[PDB]
Amino acid sequence: ELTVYVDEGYKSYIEEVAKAYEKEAGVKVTLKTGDALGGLDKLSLDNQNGNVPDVMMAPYDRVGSLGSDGQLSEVKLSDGAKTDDTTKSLVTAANGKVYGAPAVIESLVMYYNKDLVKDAPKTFADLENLAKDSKYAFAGEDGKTTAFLADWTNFYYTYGLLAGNGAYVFGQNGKDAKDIGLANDGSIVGINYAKSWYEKWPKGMQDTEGAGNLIQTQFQEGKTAAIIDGPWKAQAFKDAKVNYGVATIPTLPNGKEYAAFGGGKAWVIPQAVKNLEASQKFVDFLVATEQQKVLYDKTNEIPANTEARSYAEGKNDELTTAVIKQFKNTQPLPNISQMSAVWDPAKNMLFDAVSGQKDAKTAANDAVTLIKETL
Ligand SMILES: OC[C@H]1O[C@H](O[C@H]2[C@H](O)[C@@H](O)[C@@H](O[C@H]3[C@H](O)[C@@H](O)[C@@H](O[C@H]4[C@H](O)[C@@H](O)[C@@H](O[C@H]5[C@H](O)[C@@H](O)[C@@H](O[C@H]6[C@H](O)[C@@H](O)[C@@H](O[C@H]7[C@H](O)[C@@H](O)[C@@H](O)O[C@@H]7CO)O[C@@H]6CO)O[C@@H]5CO)O[C@@H]4CO)O[C@@H]3CO)O[C@@H]2CO)[C@H](O)[C@@H](O)[C@@H]1O
Numbered sequence: 001e002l003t004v005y006v007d008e009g010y011k012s013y014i015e016e017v018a019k020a021y022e023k024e025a026g027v028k029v030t031l032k033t034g035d036a037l038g039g040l041d042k043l044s045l046d047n048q049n050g051n052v053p054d055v056m057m058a059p060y061d062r063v064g065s066l067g068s069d070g071q072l073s074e075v076k077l078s079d080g081a082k083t084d085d086t087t088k089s090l091v092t093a094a095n096g097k098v099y100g101a102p103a104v105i106e107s108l109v110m111y112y113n114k115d116l117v118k119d120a121p122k123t124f125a126d127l128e129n130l131a132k133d134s135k136y137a138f139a140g141e142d143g144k145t146t147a148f149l150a151d152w153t154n155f156y157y158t159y160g161l162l163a164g165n166g167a168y169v170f171g172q173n174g175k176d177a178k179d180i181g182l183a184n185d186g187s188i189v190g191i192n193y194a195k196s197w198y199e200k201w202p203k204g205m206q207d208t209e210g211a212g213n214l215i216q217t218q219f220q221e222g223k224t225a226a227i228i229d230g231p232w233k234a235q236a237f238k239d240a241k242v243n244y245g246v247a248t249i250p251t252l253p254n255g256k257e258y259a260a261f262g263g264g265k266a267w268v269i270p271q272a273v274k275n276l277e278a279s280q281k282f283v284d285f286l287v288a289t290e291q292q293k294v295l296y297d298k299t300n301e302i303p304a305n306t307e308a309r310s311y312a313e314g315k316n317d318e319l320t321t322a323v324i325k326q327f328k329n330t331q332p333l334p335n336i337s338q339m340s341a342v343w344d345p346a347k348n349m350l351f352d353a354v355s356g357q358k359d360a361k362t363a364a365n366d367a368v369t370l371i372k373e374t375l
Pocket of ligand 1: 213
């Protein structure tokens with residue numbers, strides 16, 4: 001009498017937690033598996049028919065947009081959830097009602113192959129030097145490298161590059177939707193720097209679709225020293241038996257930190273659930289210290305619950321350490337409605353600039369005009 005919709009990578013986790021929740025309270029938790037973002041895309045239509053899962057996971061930006069749009073029930077933050085000021089703020093929409101319980105904090109980090117390299121690269125000049133070295137030449141197209149790869153046409157990925165250089169999405173720390181900073185001078189240096197890398201990379205890095213699969217394949221097959229990716233990738237890398245280390249993203253050519261979004265995920269409850277109390281109850285259990293520790297144990301993702309998070313910090317694995325440092329150098333993932341209009345124009349900006357189809361400034365100005373349109 002309760003259904004949880006999650007990504008495959010959480011199946012084992014939810015199976016175990018369900019088994020315990022059934023023992024503690026008297027509720028049967030059945031799981032439905034599928035694309036997380038895709039489940040949220042259809043939420044509005046599922047709310048129309050009543051056929052919604054009882055609990056699902058959302059990135060914080062989507063907690064804000066889906067919440068602001070009426071698609072989500074309000075969520076209560078129990079004492080057991082062990083939230084802090086920053087995780088509370090990440091699940092509070094502009095209105096500002098609470099539409100999720102914090103489950104994960106995350107930042108992009110640098111994964112590197114310990115079989116290929118002795119130490120973590122520290123600067124972007126280090127990554128550029130690996131580009132020079134010849135075991136990383138790409139077959140069939142030269143002179144291209146796979147020494148360092150990042151999915152820099154995904155705005156979530158590139159953002160930190162632009163922001164480290166002075167770019168911003170919205171003014172007043174992601175709140176002022178009228179002041180867009182994606183076409184400032186710093187943003188343009190970020191974009192131009194991105195371009196220089198695309199000019200050293202396989203043309204497939206510019207593919208309209210699966211650059212993500214190319215990156216993953218190259219790294220797992222021992223062809224790339226370093227990539228930038230999220231903690232969610234860890235389960236897969238362990239499966240691929242990759243001998244990976246994790247470090248903070250190397251400092252930029254300007255010496256500044258790669259200022260990735262300070263993001264993560266919450267447990268959310270669709271607006272159309274039969275029984276909100278029952279859903280809140282399982283959510284309280286999921287964010288309770290024990291289940292949050294088990295989340296770290298099963299996925300290596302960093303718990304939002306501050307007690308469970310200290311546990312992960314104590315475990316002191318390279319990934320947790322890097323996520324924690326990196327999170328100090330982030331600005332929070334914006335959760336105002338208007339963020340939802342940013343991702344697509346920004347992605348097109350990046351494709352157009354790095355391919356040289358538009359110059360960087362023009363691509364940015366065009367992206368900003370289109371974002372301005374949508375809000
Ligand atoms: O090689 C290209 C591409 O390949 C992969 O991407 C796949 C996806 O796996 C698959 O889901 C689908 O993507 C669809 C997507 O399903 C649609 O919803 C839509 O995506 C929109 C989205 O709806 C918008 O909200 C906005 O997304 C933002 C997002 O809201 C924001 O939070 C952030 O997302 C990052 C997130 O916060 C992180 O947690 C993480 O998400 C992980 C989870 O942690 C993990 O638990 C599990 O669920 O997988 C998630 C990854 O899917 O990373 C997120 C960043 O990747 O930023 C995004 C913007 O990126 O905008 C998007 C785009 O308009 O459309 C897309 C595309 O049709 O199909 C693609 C294949 O193309 C790979 O994952 C990706 O990195 C590669 O770039």
